[PDB]
Curated annotation (Swiss-Prot), chain C:
Domain of life: Eukaryota
GO CC list: cytosolic large ribosomal subunit
Annotated source species: Oryctolagus cuniculus (Rabbit)
Gene: RPL27A
Protein name per its UniProtKB record: Large ribosomal subunit protein uL15
Keyword Magnesium: no
Curated annotation (Swiss-Prot), chain F:
Record's protein name: Large ribosomal subunit protein eL28
Gene responsible for this protein: RPL28
Organism of provenance: Oryctolagus cuniculus
Keyword flag Transferase: no
Cross-link Glycyl lysine isopeptide (Lys-Gly) (interchain with G-Cter in SUMO2) per UniProt, renumbered positions: 57, 64
PTM annotation (Phosphoserine): residues: 114
Gene Ontology CC: one annotated term: ribosome
Length: 56, 52, 147, 104, 187, 125, 52
RNA sequence: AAGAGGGCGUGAAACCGUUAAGAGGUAAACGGGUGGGGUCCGCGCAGUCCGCCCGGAGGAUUCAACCCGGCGGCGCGGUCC
RNA sequence: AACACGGACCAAGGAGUCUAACACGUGCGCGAGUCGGGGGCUCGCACGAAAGCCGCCGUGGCGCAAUGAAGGUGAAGGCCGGCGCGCUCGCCGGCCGAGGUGGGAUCCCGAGGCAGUCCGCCGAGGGCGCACCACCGGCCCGUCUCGCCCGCCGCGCCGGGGA
RNA sequence: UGCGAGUGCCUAGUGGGCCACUUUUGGUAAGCAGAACUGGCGCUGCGGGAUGAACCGAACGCCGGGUUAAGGCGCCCGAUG
RNA sequence: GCCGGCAGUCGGCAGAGCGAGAAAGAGAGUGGCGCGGACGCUACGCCGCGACGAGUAGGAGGGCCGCUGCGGUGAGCCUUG
């Protein structure tokens, strides 16, 4: 129901508490600026899977 | 000053209310011992004696 | 009980619960109702309307004994007499119609507020209301004045 | 000691410490409950004990010595709630208890 | 840090009655157990209403009880009140009643028993109906106090009917500039 | 009754003693001496007490009568137990369970009678 | 009136006499220690001499 | 009892004198963290007992079950008086 | 921290109290009633300059009725049948008897299910509806406008009534 | 998309503010005077900018482990020895 | 904060449970040897989860914090202090 966004998705996200992810192991590139100019804010459309393993 | 409110007046029904509860608490010997009185040898707590 | 007062919890606090910038001075706004028209006008306007100015005529030696007129309504009318009076009514095939003396108890004018149970009566009062009569006359009673 | 007629009973229970003489018609709350505590061991005579229902009466009778007084109404009658909670008509309506402890 | 407004974190509902009496707390003790054991929501309202203040549970007049118990459907039905039962002098006939309250006035008590009624207490209510089945819960006028007539919109404000705080009612103490069209203005 | 008088004694009794972060109650017939509703020797209709014998050998066990209250001279009855320290506990055990006599103080009365028997014996070598 | 027992009258040397008195309804009155506490802590202020 | 000696019931702190110990060129003093040195404490220095069972070594005027007397609890005795 | 002020040190003393007026909240008693102020009566006052009691138990204060400057007035209508013009008006007898709408904690009935009865429990749906809020109505007093009707001990610069 | 909502009483203190991204008035300009939004200091400690109102990160019950933001890694001074 | 849980210690007058995905009962009927079971519950008490914890002026609550005196109370202490 999460991965394939079905027609009962709204209460599934409501059931899960917001994730208490830990601090990124290895450090971030730059917190202040967008991902386009070498920062880490903004749309991480593909490279978020690299960062998820550092949070968790 | 001398004119502080030394005296307090209580309603007559309230003054008559506590005396009904005070007399009714003279029975129920768990109350009497909780005050500290030695009652263990008294034959009966409502001690009524003659007019002699 | 001074031990339950707010002053015991304020021991230690420098300002003693009365502000640090504006200290608790003697009389900042003025003593009493100072400035009814000036600098306290808003409080007197939006909380005590009609405080200022004269109205009406002056009656110099006004005695409350002339204007004494206590009122009683028809809803609290059978309480003036005992319970055995009204149960001995609508009975005996006579129409007993007991007399309730309003002046005897200490009321003068009789008003028409309330609903009167269906029992003809005789009421003795110094004053009456128009709506008072039509409830008693509608029930079937009669009003008798007295001085 | 609560006495009804003064005939020397005050004269007797006078030097023996701790005994305070209370007239039946002049009973005092400051001696019937010293220190704000209701417990007090009392001594009554035959005339004193029969005047208690003539001073206050029962719930279905007037005081008969005070003008307008009757005993106050009880807020609740069955004060012992150990028998109310153990009454079969209440246990019938109760649900099953949840006494299993559920830790982290 | 977490951005949470903590000003409404503590709910301001009542937990324990402020009275130090022992008969009310025994009634609270009785109805504390019934609220968290039974599935009846009637016992929760009674437990909630047993925590109120004296100005919060207003007296219920006898005639309002007669008016509210003559409704169709509620015949052979008991009335449970959390406040006190007071006599009304402007009602003549009283039917057979079944009333449960903490306190009933002596004048109202003799009137109900004379008509063949039945006055119960809340401890006998649990023995009769522990779940409160077949009960009607009533209350007195909450806004009937003289205090609430000084509340709401302030006086000296257009289309406001609040009673002002006046030491004594006279011709020259009020109804002047601020109330008269002849004297300045009116609202 | 029982619940009515507990709310009065619970805070203003002469036997109440708090004294630096505990609470105790020193009335007679109160085993474990706690200021608790269950452990109270006066407010109950049925009362179980364990107290050492007058001669220093044995335990006198005190029962409430339940037949007549307000008569404390005849309300309590004392029986002396002096046995071989195993039937001493077995006798008191049978006074509670077999008689259906207010059974929540079954084991706690055995606990008190057990500690008394080590008071009435040689203690130090 | 609730269930009221019979209270005997004792003689001057123990030995409860045959005269028995029904317990008065005052002993069955409700017990409210706060009212007794409220009455006691206000009536006791009436015998207080002023100091200034 | 002058360790109560004529402004003499006890005799605090600021301050000063003397003795014991310790330290001392970034004024002195402080918080966190340790280390060292002291005065005393645990009257410590072959290290806690509590119940059941097993073995052999010893002693009671003793265990279960019965008889009498007393006390107590319960009794829907379906419905004793 | 200040080149802003006070502060050499130590001990003791040292500052939101009391009365009255109130408003709100809370606890208790009584309750359309409440209160005993003041006074008087019991026992001389130890405690007691306390307590108890009153056709003084209500004189009186507050509240139960308000609106008008005042003379003054003062809090309910509806249904049914008949008498005159169906004239939504005047006069005679019974009934409901303190409105309605919406939201309303609770409680009642409750299809069904946990061969066949009773004790509960849940239950789609339907209700009389506590308190309280909003609205529409209704009633009282002051005032404005439009008009007619009724009554008499004194027929009027009378009194009352309607929308 | 997320959050349990509505409502009634009293009520202290405040009524000298300041700074900053951006817009902007007078003034040559000002750590000058005066406006708008937002955020801070006031009321707030902590890491960093050597030092510090307002700058960046980040807001705080007492601790252990791990990992970071902003900053940094020749020595002072933890880390490119 | 939890519609928080605990009156169920219901014991040869007994059968020891209601953490378990699914609206309701370990419910009554009628035809075909050995006497045994740890704690508890000052229900103003005990116990279980989840979230949070800064702070000036200011407000509220708890003090088994403290001083003085009064009514009770501790068969309270004290010239062996």
């Amino acid at each position: 129901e999460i991965y394939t966004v079905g027609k009962r998705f709204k209460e599934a996200n409501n059931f899960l508490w917001p994730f208490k992810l830990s601090s990124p192991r290895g450090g971030m590139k730059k917190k202040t600026t967008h991902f386009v100019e070498g920062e880490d804010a903004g749309n991480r459309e593909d490279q978020i899977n690299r960062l998820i393993r550092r949070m968790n | 000053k001398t004119w502080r409110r030394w005296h307090r007046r209580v309603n007559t029904t309230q003054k008559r209310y506590a005396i009904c509860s005070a007399l009714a608490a003279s029975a129920l010997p768990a109350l009497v011992m909780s005050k500290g009185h030695r009652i263990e040898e008294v034959p009966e707590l409502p001690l009524v004696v003659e007019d002699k | 009980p001074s031990r339950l007062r707010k002053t015991r919890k304020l021991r230690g606090h420098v300002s003693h619960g009365h502000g640090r910038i504006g200290k608790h001075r003697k009389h900042p706004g003025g003593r009493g109702n100072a400035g009814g028209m000036h600098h306290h006008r808003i409080n007197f306007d939006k909380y005590h309307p009609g405080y200022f100015g004269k109205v009406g005529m002056r009656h110099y030696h006004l005695k409350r004994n002339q204007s004494f007129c206590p009122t009683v309504n028809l809803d609290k009318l059978w309480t003036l007499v005992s319970e055995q009076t009204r149960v001995n009514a609508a009975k005996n095939k006579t129409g007993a119609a007991p007399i309730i003396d309003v002046v005897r108890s200490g009321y003068y004018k009789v008003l028409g507020k309330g609903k009167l149970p269906k029992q003809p009566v005789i009421v003795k009062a110094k004053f009456f209301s128009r709506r008072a009569e039509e409830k008693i006359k509608g029930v079937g009673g009669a009003c008798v004045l007295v001085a | 000691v609560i006495y009804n007629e003064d005939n020397g009973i005050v004269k007797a229970f006078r030097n023996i410490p701790g005994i305070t003489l209370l007239n039946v018609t002049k009973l005092n709350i400051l001696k019937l409950a010293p220190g704000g505590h209701v417990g007090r061991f009392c001594i009554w005579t035959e005339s004193a004990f029969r005047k208690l229902d003539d001073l206050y009466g029962t719930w279905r009778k007037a005081a008969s010595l005070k003008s307008n007084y009757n005993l106050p109404m009880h807020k609740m009658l069955n004060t012992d709630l150990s028998r109310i909670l153990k009454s079969p008509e209440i246990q019938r309506a109760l649900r099953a208890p949840r006494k299993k402890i559920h830790r982290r | 840090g977490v951005d949470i407004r903590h000003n409404k974190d503590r709910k301001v509902r009542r937990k324990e009655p402020k009275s130090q009496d022992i008969y009310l707390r025994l009634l609270v003790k009785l109805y504390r157990f019934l609220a968290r054991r039974t599935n009846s929501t009637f016992n929760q309202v009674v437990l909630k209403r047993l925590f109120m203040s004296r100005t919060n549970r207003p007296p219920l007049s006898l005639s309002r009880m007669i008016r509210k118990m003559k409704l169709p459907g509620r015949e052979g039905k008991t009335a449970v009140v959390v406040g006190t039962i007071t006599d009304d002098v402007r009602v003549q006939e009283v039917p057979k009643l079944k009333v449960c309250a903490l306190r009933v006035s002596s004048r109202a008590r003799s009137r109900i028993l004379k008509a063949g009624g039945k006055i119960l207490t809340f401890d006998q209510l649990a023995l009769d109906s522990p779940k409160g089945c077949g009960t009607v819960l009533l209350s007195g006028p909450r806004k009937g106090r003289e205090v609430y007539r000084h509340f709401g919109k302030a006086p000296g404000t257009p289309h406001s009917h609040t009673k002002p705080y006046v030491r004594s009612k006279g011709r020259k103490f009020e109804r002047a500039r601020g109330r008269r069209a002849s004297r300045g203005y009116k609202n | 009754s029982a619940h009515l008088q507990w709310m009065v004694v619970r805070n203003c009794s002469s036997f109440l003693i708090k004294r630096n972060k505990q609470t105790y109650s020193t009335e007679p017939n109160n085993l474990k001496a706690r200021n608790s509703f269950r452990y109270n020797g006066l407010i109950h209709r049925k009362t179980v007490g364990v107290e050492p014998a007058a001669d220093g050998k044995g335990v006198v066990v005190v029962m409430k009568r339940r037949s007549g209250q307000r008569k404390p001279a005849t309300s309590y009855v004392r029986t002396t137990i002096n046995k071989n320290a195993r039937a001493t506990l077995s006798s008191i055990r049978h006074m509670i369970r077999k008689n259906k006599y207010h059974p929540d103080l079954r084991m706690a009365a055995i606990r008190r009678a057990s500690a008394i028997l080590r008071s009435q014996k040689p203690v130090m070598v | 009136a609730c269930a009221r027992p019979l209270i005997s009258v004792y003689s001057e040397k123990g030995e409860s006499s045959g005269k028995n008195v029904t317990l008065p309804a005052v002993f069955k009155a409700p017990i409210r220690p706060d009212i007794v506490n409220f009455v006691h802590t206000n009536l006791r202020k009436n015998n207080r001499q002023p100091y200034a």
